[PDB]
């Protein structure tokens, strides 16, 4: 039995919005301590791990863990009915064949009850997170969003390279080149909105932009994206939430 | 001879905007007491009846009734030249081969004179309005607009059913279900913006959404759409105007 | 050697925006006194001549004249990286194989360095400007923009005709007709925003709208477009700049 309600329906949509570089389809494991999901690129090159905690909801109740396999595209659509930011409630039962979605308005007071036919897919769950990453850095999602979108113009292949206190975003296609090169630093100034690099190694990794754009789509979710990168491993892009995160592991080329 | 001028050109466009689920083509019967038109779906399943009264214009003059058969799509385009909301004048003569359209600005004072080649089509005019409808109801266009657009996601086939003081909008496609269920009621409160049901029978009618969306397009014209529904008959959706209406008769499935 | 920096990057984009009815490709001759370019329709019917002066830049330095042949579409894209209105710097060297573009923010202080592979195209440069034009007129770009876009609906062929103190923009396709007829005049009133006709002859010229729309795209650049027209010759549409212009010579039909 499950009753999970976001105060602000806007949220769950945004989260679901971070698929679509995900395989139209996904399992939503609903434990006692919230929800997690796992989607993978059709060619197994990007992985989206989601985690939403109890404190992220307005109210949450899961009596016994239940796994909600569903078709994203489909669930995506139902979320359109959602006038975003008022009171999506998710619901399921002892044995679930469909998940129920209750949008609402509290004091305009119009409630609609949509159900989605549950898919039931086979769940090979992955734990590829490394402990140590050659480099970690975290800049504000919004900036990264441009740097991605901007380089994505020139090249199909965006190269990220970190040198001592120097991060270099370099795209080089056949039409031309471009490079964004930015300090860490920290202004004691605005708010956070600063650049944070802790380096253990140099790195020279290069990723398909097509994916980067699909990653940075979840730029809306956080203020600040944390990137981790290592040679023999993939890169981890992390957007943070009230008491959970959305994260994209994306394999580098070569 | 005809000289018909809307003060606000915005209007006539909006009205013409309620075709397009109409057959690119239509007769515009211009009597002494205003204009009426009649379009039908290519497959004869939707009917759009328009009526615009004298009081709806800023000025109107028809010396002898005249029938203006014209190509909507074409006339639609000329209306684009219209900076909406300033002084469309329609014009025609004793025997008409083209209708003239004079857009203007009163005190910016730029006038443009467009003519449209009159089509001349054969006019089987229909009077299928029943006297008694099993149920009448009227809610605010804007709400209905969502309920239509929203259910239109899940199903291709939206079912409207009225039970004693309970209207149920139910869409059930193969991807999932959805149901919007709303009271009548009346708040003595805001303005009108209330829900009005007078029931004589239960009804369980189901219509193609594809059409419903084409009907609710004319949501802009009124504040409040009046729906009438009966079993052996079609449904009548009515948007109201200064001294006239636009209305869609749409046949139910089965 | 070249260092050319617009204070407001917005500008150079807008200028480049006035191609696309230009052959994806163009030479940019960078003299000591600024830049000029010349593009032509693939079928040689429209010509775009650009001239940007020193005073139009924030700073400009050309040590010896250099010619920058480049692919518009490509250069167009790099300009997207430009958050329009902050500090595009163009750069090239003694012998140039690529032009470098430095976007910036002055006190947000994020700099990106893009290079574009220089094309090298063969330069047949044209000087078809007549001295005397049967008629000159200049109205505000914005008005002309509508009159073009509006007539462009009815016809494929827009006819401009100037009679004594009467300019007549007439489109007549097969769907219908339209005519915009406007006085010169002058209100000593608003600002400029007046209509200016000096006539030496009648004219009855007719141009492809498809092009007119491509011409009036550069409506953003000036407030006021100057049109010149002569029978045996093409028409000259001129948009004006800080210390230069963009201009379209377009041949009339027949």
UniProtKB/Swiss-Prot annotation, chains A, B, C:
It comes from the Eukaryota. Coiled coil: none annotated. Pfam families: PCNA_C (PF02747), PCNA_N (PF00705). GO terms for biological process: error-free translesion synthesis; establishment of mitotic sister chromatid cohesion; lagging strand elongation; leading strand elongation; maintenance of DNA trinucleotide repeats; meiotic mismatch repair; mismatch repair; mitotic cell cycle. PROSITE patterns: PCNA_1, PCNA_2. Keywords: DNA damage, DNA repair, DNA replication, DNA-binding, Isopeptide bond, Nucleus, Ubl conjugation. It comes from Saccharomyces cerevisiae (strain ATCC 204508 / S288c). The keyword Isomerase does not apply. Residues 61-80 bind DNA. Sumoylated on Lys-164, and to a lesser extent on Lys-127 by the UBC9/SIZ1 complex during S-phase; which impairs ubiquitination and function in DNA repair. Monoubiquitinated on Lys-164 by the UBC2/RAD18 complex upon DNA damage, and then polyubiquitinated through 'Lys-63'-linkage by UBC13/MMS2. Ubiquitination is required for UBC2-mediated DNA repair. This protein is an auxiliary protein of DNA polymerase delta and is involved in the control of eukaryotic DNA replication by increasing the polymerase's processibility during elongation of the leading strand. Involved in DNA repair. HAMAP family: DNApol_clamp_arch. This is Proliferating cell nuclear antigen.
